[PDB]
């Protein structure tokens, strides 16, 4: 009920299944309810669902730390069991359809119904008999804090997602054994590079190399890593010495430019992605480009990448598991030595 | 609850209490319910409240006969006792607000609390308990289908409104005795005539001298009923010899027009009046005037009050006690006789 | 794109496929097209769908014969091969989704898809290669204007729709021969009786037995035609003596009592079924009836069906095949003879 | 102001400069107005403009007889001169700026700024002074009910449109004699047919041809008028035997067959036009045209046109000027008589 | 005027009461004026209200320094006299109704009239005659900047809302005195402690012993202040160890813990009262708790309210006296010790 619901948010901050209404009122994408005489907003819509259905949908949002919305759509997770994954960077639910959470939205009330069998099911293992659910599934994808029986779990990323918030859980638990089943049969999910999910102005080194290319100069940065012959001063770095922007495809490069000047970020497409697409323009000199790939990886991770390439190829696209899913990379090389290397097709 | 009300609207066609729910999606100012995987439009909000609001309002809206809505203005009635009474002119609630009907525009539970003290609060004596409510009110006005002890009655219209649609009724009584209270003491409303709520395409007379109108030329009739002197040529048939129009104050003589030239009929003020002004415009001559004050008199009690008017005076405003209210014509004569008359101030 | 479907259907009614562009405005869930310097109105969205989604769906509606939306309703039809079913009494697309017509509402480019396969997918034989695919297709339904090879056809309704209007074709081919296949294996569709989707206020008689029903009195009809014992006067006459309404469950009766005195029909749930449901409000005596099952049977197939039964029971509930779909009927007798036959559950 | 608009509004049913204000709230793109507590609505916006700025615009417009709105567009009239001509068709005003009528559309306060120059103003000579602004405008159209000195006029129309009732005057002048001036020059208008801007559903004849179709059947009006060999029967009467329906290119036949079967109009463009394009579907036989061109002459001047044409050739566009501009018809002759003749391009 | 106050507004930031007009447009719940030719956006609808007449309250809005509006709250204050009081954490008004302000939200023009006796209207001393007023005033709160002949004061907080800027003033003048009329009779205003209405991200310590907490570790200040038993390394700095979040209900130690880990706080109710509740979570440990009370009370002032409860019980609820109303806190203790203490119902 929108009502109930209502009161679960107004006395709760979420939908908990309590009993109990409160007023309200629904005008311009927007829900509100009567404290005291006086009307006080919720919730405002940004989502293509009905205002209600929405309201409900965020009400009824997973509260506990989720894998981020890239990890599932990198795993083509569809939608998930008895629970609403919400996307905080669009502020819509993550998925179009539930099982047994809203009616307007829902196509099953469990999993196990003949419409979520082609659909990859999400499945959470700290929830009871999701584990067993996930095993009668034929399509899914499972986590869990620990082990599971039988099956061998593959190692996701240290952080997740608690309430919009990405961080390394210390008193809750936020990495998660993956599991995945197509067509009724397990698979075995590919060795794989995380993005560290971190932003701009609040960029935290996370390792040592970074701590050095935080502090560090270019030089003595490129020197003590011993990363001559890698393009580093234009990849990771950048180029602000042309009217188009050169490099500058490494968050870490961008957050050590916002240090010292800060420039702007136009996220044009606004979702949750492995490789994120900017129009950056620097506020200092004017260089600025249209299209700038983004991707949030460790820099000792990169940096492996990097070295692990063969340098005597002209032109060649390099395959990274990154998130549970293949990036392609251009690596322009001349001289057996790096002249350039980022996310294609950006 | 919103899905409940919904539940009870496409089960029952109004809110009669009955427990379930159906999916509803809120969109557009409209209510919308999923029937078989479609989504139906409910109820398309033409009010000023919140649609939720406007719909459980309608939902909970009177479907038994009730008074109409002009009546009720010109007792005063400002509120209802647990009902809405719903006003299908402007397709909104009548009063803004309610006793124990909707959370968002309650302003109280029961009649007897403060806040309907100095409010005069509408009664219903066919529901049960209400003529004790009424007698314990300090203000309010009670409509009874039979006599109340010690109460002396005012017989209303003999027509009230059935779900929008005014009606003199045969299977259902319709006609109502009013009982008004002021400050705790039971008033004596006045002796009144009461307009007919007819409609222009759908006229009907409900006299021999209305039939006599109808069927019988100009000079039959005002030489048969003895209405020489009295302009009945402009007052009721109407001049339509000028670019602006002259007289047409009675729906009659417009429903008699219509009937051998249809014309055009803006409402601006589209709402319950006793006398409903319009933008008339002749389609046959082009005769037109933007402030047309048309009433719905019975031609006999019309043709009683023009003649008990003293003929001998150049300009006087008459003051006619009509509807429970006093509406005021002014009347322009010379050499004994009736130039003009129509409801003043249009 | 949104520019030519309207350049389409400013220069041909609709969706043709011709190249063009037009200017394009949309506000308040309205397209409009500039003429000449001022913004014309091309559509209204009365959808749930975005406004641009369903003007495109609009535009590329079937404006071909098709069958009634119920009727395809009660085939079990979820979508339509390459093709928009448009439902004009909801004002919206009869389906949620479509295959090969939107890009935003399409699930697939070909019914041949995995994703079809469980749905029952709409196969029109007039379209070249549908055949073919329904004869492919795991679930579908399959309408053509002839025979076809190997399959035993379903005779449906005569009429169709035609851009909203409901006929018996002349000029064009509106009898379709009706095939389903359900998982993959051709069903026997049963023998039924088909509404005739007649309109209250333009209600015409498609049968001698209906001639005399609106020409003749009560007593006279039922006479003539042995119907004593079977409540015709209240089943379909109606009985407008109490405030609740009696009976009048078929349209014919509503029809007649409409030619002799206008009512009020309230169509609380403005969609296509088999039997409607309407608050209809009597203008003359006041009876009302808030939820009054209407269906629209040949009045021959109607006495043939309540002739049919068995009047040696108290209550009974009456399964009738009417539009491929069971409708169940509340039968209560007494003493050998019929006391009321309405559609169940109202 | 808004609500001085509103008082004007509400107190004379239009804009007449009367001193007052009453409160107003918008919302849903509408106007409302408080009387006696409650929300009266006083207008809905159905244009593209600011809900006020079309309020005020509509308040504005001229409740005298004015030329209709496809006689001025043919003119070229871009604007108008101190008055707002409302387009009816289109729920809007006519011209997207004006002359010292509403601040947020007004391009100039007087007719004589420099900006108004290039621009066909619209004059009325029956507002003082405005035969003097024409005659010092560069471009301008001017309408009189009278003659003016030195200029030479040009009979338009005998219908004109009074409140959006086209109508021949009778207690008002519509006709007008109508002046045009190109850069500073006078022109001569062409002599040109006018349409009667008449409606399907009201159709009245105004001459005995017309008379006498709608009467006679189509063989004895065929041979009584010496019609033969004009292909009168598809043309006017049109062909229903096919599935796309043929001629029926005057409204007078559409009415003619609209009195014997009520049949659909869909107006994919409601706009004023000398030529009409419709959907046409015939609820009798099912023919249907997606675009079907309908031109509402009087009978006795399509009979001149077509009769004034070169029967000896196969195809030829034929030019008439019809409402001050010229139309192109298609002539499809064979063996000295016509096949085909109907509005080009469709 | 809407064009009048939109002039006001544009000429001196806010309505002044000064004569002229500007070009308005409304749309999307936005009032825009023209400057040279291009809309400029002058106010967006945040709330409930029609948005010209929300537009005409904010410009209304008092822009001297008025009580915040939670103490307004807890005085019981339903309206206030010839002002708006403009809640700037809704972004709306604070009461629904107004006296003398805005036509469309009056409920009477001075504060005398009948429907305001039983209302607490709010009375500005500053004002003249609005002392007088709310001398003969039944209900009603009274502020000044001085002292009131025959009343006795009440002290209120030290600062007042000025624009929305909540702040101690000291070229203005933001500590009043308050005074309370309940049924005519002036009422003894309790003895209370005031929150600070401090925000997190500009916190600023208003005392030494918040001083010592800010820079102090916990240890330090606890032995310093003599603060051991009363848990205040939960209740104030809070518990990040486990999953769910303990204690921290003063706003001093989420600002404590903000200065060194930045988190999330979540006002899923938006609105001013002496609690607040978020929805808490952690960035550093993952701690969250749905619902968080917390007060922003000076240390000081807790600190006394803490030491002089009686520690010998186990369960207690503890009513104090806060911003004028009655704050409700459960005090848990065991072996004369505190181990909790937090406002209930939270």
Request: aromatic share 10%; hydrophobic share 40%.
């Given at each position: ?28 994408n ?8 006086v ?69 099953a ?9 082609p ?13 067993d ?30 309430n ?51 502090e ?20 990771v ?83 990274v ?5 293949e990036?392609?990379?251009?690596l ?15």
């Amino acid at each position: 009920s929108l009502e109930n619901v209502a009161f679960n948010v107004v006395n709760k901050g979420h939908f908990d299944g309590q009993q109990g209404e409160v007023p309200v009122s629904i005008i311009n994408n927007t829900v509100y309810t009567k404290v005291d005489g006086v009307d006080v907003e919720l919730f405002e819509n940004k989502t293509t669902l009905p205002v209600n259905v929405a309201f409900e949908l965020w009400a009824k949002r997973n509260i506990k730390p989720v894998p981020e919305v890239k990890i599932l759509n990198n795993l083509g997770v569809d939608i998930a069991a008895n629970t609403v994954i919400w996307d905080y960077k669009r502020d819509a639910p993550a998925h179009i359809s539930t099982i047994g959470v809203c009616s307007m939205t829902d196509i099953a009330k469990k999993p196990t119904e003949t419409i979520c069998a082609p659909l990859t099911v999400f499945f959470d293992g700290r929830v009871d008999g999701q584990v067993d659910l996930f095993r009668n599934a034929r399509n899914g994808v499972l986590i869990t804090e620990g082990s599971v029986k039988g099956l061998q779990p593959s190692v996701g990323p240290k952080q997740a997602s608690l309430n919009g918030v990405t961080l390394i859980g210390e008193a809750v638990k936020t990495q998660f054994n993956y599991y995945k089943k197509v067509d009724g049969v397990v698979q075995q999910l590919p060795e794989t590079y995380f993005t560290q999910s971190r932003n701009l102005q609040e960029f935290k080194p996370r390792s040592q190399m970074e701590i050095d290319f935080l502090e560090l100069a270019m030089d003595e940065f490129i020197e003590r890593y011993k990363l001559e012959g890698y393009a580093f001063e234009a990849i990771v770095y950048g180029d602000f010495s042309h009217s188009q922007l050169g490099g500058l495809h490494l968050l870490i490069g961008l957050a050590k430019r916002f240090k010292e000047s800060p420039f702007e970020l136009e996220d044009f497409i606004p979702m949750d992605s492995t490789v994120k697409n900017y129009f950056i323009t620097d506020a200092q000199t004017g260089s600025s480009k249209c299209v700038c790939s983004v991707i949030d990886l460790l820099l000792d991770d990169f940096v492996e990448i990097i070295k692990s390439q063969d340098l005597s190829v002209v032109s060649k696209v390099v395959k990274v598991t990154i998130d549970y899913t293949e990036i392609s990379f251009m690596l322009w090389c001349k001289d057996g030595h790096v002249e350039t290397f980022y996310p294609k097709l950006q």
